[PDB]
Design a protein around this motif. Structure first.
Motif, PDB file in Angstrom:
ATOM      1  N   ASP A 159      -1.511  -1.120  -0.550  1.00  8.92           N
ATOM      2  CA  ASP A 159      -0.645  -0.801   0.575  1.00  8.92           C
ATOM      3  C   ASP A 159       0.022   0.554   0.378  1.00  8.92           C
ATOM      4  O   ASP A 159       0.294   0.981  -0.743  1.00  8.92           O
ATOM      5  N   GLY A 195       3.107   1.386   1.473  1.00  6.15           N
ATOM      6  CA  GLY A 195       4.555   1.344   1.362  1.00  6.15           C
ATOM      7  C   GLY A 195       5.285   2.040   2.493  1.00  6.15           C
ATOM      8  O   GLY A 195       6.412   2.511   2.301  1.00  6.15           O
ATOM      9  N   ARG A 196       4.674   2.111   3.675  1.00 10.03           N
ATOM     10  CA  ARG A 196       5.242   2.805   4.823  1.00 10.03           C
ATOM     11  C   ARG A 196       5.900   1.864   5.820  1.00 10.03           C
ATOM     12  O   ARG A 196       6.317   2.310   6.893  1.00 10.03           O
ATOM     13  N   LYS A 197       6.000   0.579   5.503  1.00 10.56           N
ATOM     14  CA  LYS A 197       6.555  -0.372   6.455  1.00 10.56           C
ATOM     15  C   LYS A 197       7.617  -1.256   5.809  1.00 10.56           C
ATOM     16  O   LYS A 197       8.422  -1.885   6.498  1.00 10.56           O
TER      17      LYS A 197
HETATM   18  K   LIG Z   1       2.571   0.180   4.703  1.00 16.47           K
END
Ligand SMILES: [K+]
Ligand SMILES: [K+]
Ligand SMILES: [K+]
Ligand SMILES: [Mg+2]
Ligand SMILES: [Mg+2]
Length: 136
Positions: free
Chosen positions: A132, A134-136
């Motif tokens: 992932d 890590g942008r959410k």
């Molecule tokens: K993300």
RNA sequence: ACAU
DNA sequence: CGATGT
């Protein structure tokens, strides 16, 4: 359960959807980044997820690896199974690149074989997939 | 609904 | 809040 730790995990990252799309594949056990695609100026989340799985297939086949691939995308797993990416993205000059890559990924699927299991990463049980962004 |  | 998908 349980997690198959001897596997490759893939995921998409985007800036907008549709928007700039990239993807990467990592070693599920160690998080080592094994491949990363140069950002594509316009695409969808599901096109990127599909490209990531197909790239993983090609990566593992080239290396004579029987590891499975994890993806968190119900959509992209089905598109790979069907060998057909049923995207709604308009085909125009701005989207030509992503659509070329998608067309070429389908073409590769239709001309090659693989035994690689493509497995659903169970985010609700296991947390975010190891690839992932890590942008959410 | 579910998956992003 | 918006969007992509089955
Ligand atoms: K993300
Ligand atoms: K997710
Ligand atoms: K929806
Ligand atoms: Mg994902
Ligand atoms: Mg993600």
């Amino acid at each position: 359960e349980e997690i198959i730790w001897e596997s490759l995990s893939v995921d998409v990252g985007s800036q907008g959807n549709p928007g700039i799309v990239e993807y990467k594949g990592v070693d599920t056990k160690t998080g080592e980044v094994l491949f990363e695609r140069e950002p594509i100026p316009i695409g969808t989340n599901n096109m990127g997820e599909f490209l990531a799985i197909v790239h993983g297939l090609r990566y593992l086949k080239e290396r004579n690896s029987r590891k499975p691939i994890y993806s968190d995308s119900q959509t992209a797993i089905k598109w790979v199974k069907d060998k057909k990416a049923k995207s709604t993205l308009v085909r125009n000059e701005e989207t030509a690149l992503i659509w070329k890559l998608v067309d070429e990924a389908e073409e590769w699927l239709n001309t090659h074989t693989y035994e690689t299991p493509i497995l659903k990463w169970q985010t609700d049980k296991w947390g975010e997939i190891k690839a992932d962004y890590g942008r959410k």
